[PDB]
Design a protein around this ligand. Structure first.
Ligand SMILES: CCCCCCCCCCCCC/C=C/[C@@H](O)C(CO)NC(=O)CCCCCCC
Ligand SMILES: CCCCCCCCCCCCC/C=C/[C@@H](O)C(CO)NC(=O)CCCCCCC
Lengths: 271, 254, 238, 55, 271, 60, 55, 60, 55, 59
């Protein structure tokens, strides 16, 4: 909840509530009660919706891929290296804090589309997919059927099209006491090579694939990944991203104006 | 007046002395003992030979050489021919027992080498030839030690004796999870283990199942300068502990 | 009917779920439990056990038992190096295949101290002093007995006690380290050097062998389950 | 063994956790902590509004 | 939970914490407090995830089969002799212990695919399957319709495609006080014949089949079996499988190197 | 089986929902929390901070 | 007749078994026993770290 | 609607299940129980009974 | 108004009947009665094992 | 649950546990404790799965 207004009458003193020294770096705790007369107002407004928890706690697409039901050579499955910088929306949000800590709520929205052919007599059964997570170091799949899909240890989800979207929870899997949103450092101790957040980045890959081919007719399924931070903790606020994003592995940008211009320094007709 | 090398073990008419030892490894911390009425299935009264069977039997010796890859002895059987143990073993369908294994080997202050003495329970072995199963004679030869090889074994029905895998498809250097001691000529003289009965059943037949295999593999090859005694033997001595038997009948094995 | 609203994740199959389920065999009377020796409760009780490290996994020796034999002999110079491998227990050709290594390869995160034990297997008439040392990552890798010695170390004299226990302590910027080789999570370097050449009398072997065992300390732990990269398969077996 | 918390109004709601890993729980939105003194007034020296920032 | 670190200062004694006799077979209880100075560190790390229970408790595919909706002569159903050695993943895990005891959580993932033809006017209804377990000694099915599918006693599961995957629980059905992972023994008392685990192996077969043919168009369904040990007990640890597997009924292997090689016994550049 | 009547909204995916869900990683031991300085609890603590205004955002 | 157990954290969760066969229950992961003394120090003779393994 | 998450095994038919189910015939008044002799409680009471063994099941 | 019964082991399970007709309930498998004396020893004359069936 | 085994030693009596008159129609309540020596065995086996209820209760 917000602070309510205090009743104010006229004043005559050597007290200077109106003047400070911004050079201090301290922000003024000046209310309207100073510098003007005010009535009394019991303010009930709540800041409940601007809590860090609520600002972040909302599913957001972070990526998506494709894969066919058919293809000789295996080669008809997809993968994606987990990371939250390939999407503009959420990245900018998470990047309003230097360090953060939170659990994640994974939600997948799987859909299938059928493409044009010549194939006839098609009466396709339900489609069942498989999303498999592979922690870093684990054996990665090669073809739509390499042994590794047994997931004897790697966790994964099986899902039949037509049902409620799949969903899981992930604990704070960070190595350090928190996730790093930025990293003004290098990977190797001789500053040679990778520079940027891209070095802290290392959370395994996600593998998708059709379990059953369905029919002989060509089909293309798409998997959408949705993150949703929970039980959040945030440290060190930062200036929101001004320039548009240019790369997923770094801060790179092309210089941008601070805002838009108007005619005079006096124009109320804002841009 | 002592040394944690000194050591005197006695069971029956047999007695063991240790002028150089480490300690005494004891199974999985479990010391052998007679089967309780709570863990039993066989309802007939068991026989407990005691002194007549729980004593020290000393198998045939083997010569260690600069090339010796290793040796092994399956166990339930190996004592199949030792006095009244082997006997009670032939007349009964069921039996269970613990053991006190004592491997002995001695050299001079000028010799050097190092042996690994382990007790692998349920040491199932593979065949030299993928398509078949290794014949019995290749698996165990009673008191006669079997040998590992410093290379791949060959065809028919032999065991894939290449030492690096202990014929079990594992990394020979990891056998150390099972009960073991090292005989490092430089500081050792003998190794002693106390294997308790270990199996997924209170009792078992003794000719159909080998609940564990003793292996003696040298990791540090034997060596010595010219003039030094050249024949360095290894001798295994084992003693059954708390042997019970059930299901008496005529003797043999099918 | 009690009003119900199904939530996402329904009719889903999660490998690592954990719900109750109907028994296909009702009132089944299970066979009573026995007391088999050597019960394990946690995979760590395993990794706290010593296993021989194939330190000399050099030039074809990985096919022989010599892979575990560290070569040592009488030298006409001081400070010569004996061996060296990186503290990368998870993905290092030397370690990764040990008891500790095997376990590690079933996870992705690790933290803790390590015990490296060395056993001198030369004639009882042979002598010598060695310098076992661990140098954290940061500078290069030690290439002199000096340099190596500026790190954490123990000087092992070979007397009646033929087994020396060096102890790599946990020292990292982060709590855990990746099981895979990531330079962010570098682990440092392990080296061994002659402190005082191997001295032997006449008629006694100059060259000997040292064995090395690796195992985890009581502060070791692991996280994040994953399949081992060590076992493959092409068709169902038969 | 459940728990009752008040709802967001201008009445409560019961709740039980069914999973073993706390990560499975829902976002805690009934939270309301706040310290602006970190970001504003981060001066080692306390400032009186009535007074000047230089004297 | 793990043990925390003890504060250590400098020492000067005849105490030899740094030297033992590995020949003992006893593993050293040496901490870093010995052989070096240390600060005090309250360690909170938990071993919770390395518990035998958690290491095994994760569904893993153990096998799978096929069967057509059509075929004259019956002959269009499948079967599989329960066993956990035809898959590399899980076998190696279970084989890290000599004896184990546990309940099993069965989960089946059934999918159907349609093959090419000439058939027309296909408007195929939902597919319903039947998985039937047959304890050893029970009467086994011959054709897609032999009386034995009545399962008057044998338990089985009926499932309609499109729904959540089928699942049951099995108690510890072992004869002895535990499951045996290895068996250095024979089947007959005259060491003649079968040698290996293959002798303890005997847990019945699993039969699958389409209940309804669906349409006249050719269809091929595949059943995937997933085990998942629960309430686990493990005894006598073993060296993980080094050599690759070669047979499902035995330990057979072809000799393998202990690890990979590097250039020198001094090369830090590991392989 | 306890009689159940599903209500509208079932099997639905609402971006801003808030239900419990199964953990893909059981008994995971999270890394202990540290005490990083300058923690934020609400986006307002931000907006109560001063920033320079580009008032003369005029002619280029 | 339910039961409350603590969750896995850095709060509890209620639980009831609905089936008659205990095999139907979920995996007990709140377990935490451990004895390394089986595998390490399986010597009949207790060893003092400060002392030598031969004297 | 009370939030629900269905688990695998749903809408499944397990021969050996054991759940409650709606009665097709409500408030039916069953015929009172009588006391027939020789009631069996377990199939073992059967097997504890002697029966003749065809030991000489030889040549026809 | 529920009821707790022990499970089949080598812990209990709660249970409530939701239907009005007892026929709707699940099979009672926690049952364990037994009288072999009906089928064996159905003699009006009690027989001592140590004794003979003719004297 | 099943009955456990009783510890049995050697005997010498006019007691005939080994002989009856099957012509009686009464089934013998002869355990292995008679006609042979036996150890003591606390038997935990349960007949739970052979109950009439369970024998029939399966679709
Ligand atoms: C079937 C179930 C499948 C479950 C799959 C779960 C996959 C993991 C998803 C984790 C998403 C974490 C998002 C946190 C943001 C951090 O990426 C950032 C953001 O700039 N940088 C950083 O990378 C921070 C550096 C921290 C390093 C952590 C190492 C693990
Ligand atoms: C509709 C419901 C259908 C339910 C079907 C249930 C089928 C039974 C699945 C049992 C799986 C057991 C797995 C345990 C591993 C043992 O196989 C091993 C492993 O090497 N050896 C061994 O074989 C150990 C020897 C023990 C012998 C036990 C005899 C039953």
């Amino acid at each position: 909840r917000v602070a309510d207004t205090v009743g104010s009458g006229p004043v005559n003193s050597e007290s200077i509530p109106a003047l400070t020294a911004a050079e201090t770096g301290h922000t003024s705790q000046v209310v309207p009660s100073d510098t003007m007369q005010t009535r009394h107002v019991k303010n009930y407004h709540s800041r409940s919706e601007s809590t860090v928890e609520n600002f972040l706690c909302r599913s957001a697409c972070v990526f998506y891929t494709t894969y066919k039901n058919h293809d000789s050579d295996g080669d008809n499955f997809a993968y994606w290296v987990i990371n939250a910088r390939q999407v503009a929306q959420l990245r900018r949000k998470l990047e309003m804090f230097t360090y953060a800590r939170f659990d994640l709520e994974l939600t997948f929205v799987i859909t299938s589309t059928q493409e044009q052919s010549t194939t006839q007599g098609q009466d396709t059964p339900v489609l069942t997919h498989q999303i498999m997570y592979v922690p870093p170091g684990g054996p990665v799949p090669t073809k739509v059927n390499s042994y590794s899909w047994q997931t004897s240890t790697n966790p994964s989800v099986f899902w039949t099209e037509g049902n409620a979207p799949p969903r899981m929870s992930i604990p704070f899997i960070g190595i350090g006491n928190a996730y790093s949103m930025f990293y003004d450092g290098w990977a190797r101790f001789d500053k040679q090579g990778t520079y940027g957040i891209s070095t802290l980045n290392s959370m395994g890959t996600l593998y998708m694939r059709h379990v059953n081919g369905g029919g002989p007719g060509p089909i293309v399924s798409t998997v959408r990944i949705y993150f949703k931070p929970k039980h959040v903790k945030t440290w060190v606020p930062r200036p929101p991203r001004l320039c548009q994003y240019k790369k997923a592995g770094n801060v790179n940008f092309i210089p941008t104006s601070v805002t838009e211009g108007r005619t005079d320094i006096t124009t109320m007709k804002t841009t | 007046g002592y040394s944690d090398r000194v050591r005197s073990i006695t069971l029956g008419n047999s007695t063991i002395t240790t002028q150089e030892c480490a300690n005494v490894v004891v199974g999985y911390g479990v010391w052998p003992a007679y089967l309780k009425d709570e863990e039993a299935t066989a309802e007939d009264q068991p026989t407990q030979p005691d002194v007549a069977t729980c004593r020290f039997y000393t198998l045939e010796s083997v010569m260690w050489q600069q090339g010796s890859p290793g040796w092994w002895w399956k166990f339930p059987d190996a004592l199949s021919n030792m006095g009244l143990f082997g006997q009670n073993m032939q007349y009964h369908y069921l039996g269970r027992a613990g053991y006190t294994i004592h491997v002995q080997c001695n050299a001079s202050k000028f010799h050097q080498g190092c042996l690994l003495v382990v007790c692998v329970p349920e040491a199932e072995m593979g065949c030299a030839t993928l398509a078949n199963k290794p014949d019995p004679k290749s698996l165990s030869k009673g008191e006669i030690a079997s040998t590992f090889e410093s290379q791949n074994s060959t065809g028919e029905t032999a065991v894939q004796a290449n030492v690096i895998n202990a014929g079990m498809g594992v990394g020979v250097g990891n056998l150390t999870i099972f009960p073991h001691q090292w005989i490092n000529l430089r500081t050792n003289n003998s190794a002693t283990i106390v294997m308790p009965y270990i199996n997924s059943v209170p009792m078992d037949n003794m000719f159909r199942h080998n609940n564990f295999t003793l292996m003696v593999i040298p990791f540090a090859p034997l060596s010595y300068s010219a003039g030094a005694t050249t024949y360095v033997p290894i001798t295994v001595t084992v003693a059954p502990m708390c042997a019970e038997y059930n299901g008496l009948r005529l003797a043999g094995k099918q | 009917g009690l009003p119900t609203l199904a939530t996402p994740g329904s009719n889903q199959f999660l490998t690592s779920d954990d719900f109750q389920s109907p028994s296909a065999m009702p009132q089944f009377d299970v066979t009573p439990e026995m007391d088999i020796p050597g019960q394990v409760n946690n995979l760590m009780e395993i990794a706290e056990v010593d296993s021989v490290v194939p330190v000399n996994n050099t030039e074809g020796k990985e096919m022989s038992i010599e892979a575990y034999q560290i070569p040592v002999q009488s030298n006409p110079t001081n400070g010569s190096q004996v061996f060296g491998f990186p503290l990368t227990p998870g993905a290092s050709s030397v370690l990764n295949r040990t008891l500790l290594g095997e376990i590690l390869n079933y996870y992705a995160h690790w933290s803790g101290s390590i015990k490296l034990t060395f056993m001198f297997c030369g004639s009882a008439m042979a002598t010598g002093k060695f310098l076992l040392a661990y140098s954290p990552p940061g500078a290069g890798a030690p290439t002199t007995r000096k340099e190596a010695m500026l790190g954490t170390h123990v000087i092992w004299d070979v007397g009646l006690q033929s087994s020396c226990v060096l102890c790599i302590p946990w020292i990292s910027q982060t709590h855990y380290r990746y099981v895979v080789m990531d330079e962010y999570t570098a682990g440092g370097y392990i080296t061994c050097w002659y402190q005082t050449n191997i001295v032997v009398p006449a008629d006694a072997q100059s060259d000997c062998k040292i064995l090395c065992f690796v195992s985890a300390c009581n502060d070791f732990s692991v996280r994040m389950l994953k399949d081992t990269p060590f076992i493959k398969q092409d068709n169902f077996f038969q | 063994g459940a728990q009752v918390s008040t709802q967001k109004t201008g009445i409560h709601y019961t709740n039980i956790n069914y999973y073993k890993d706390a990560a499975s729980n829902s976002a805690n939105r009934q939270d309301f902590t706040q310290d602006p003194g970190k970001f504003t007034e981060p001066v080692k020296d306390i400032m009186v509004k009535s007074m000047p920032a230089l004297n």
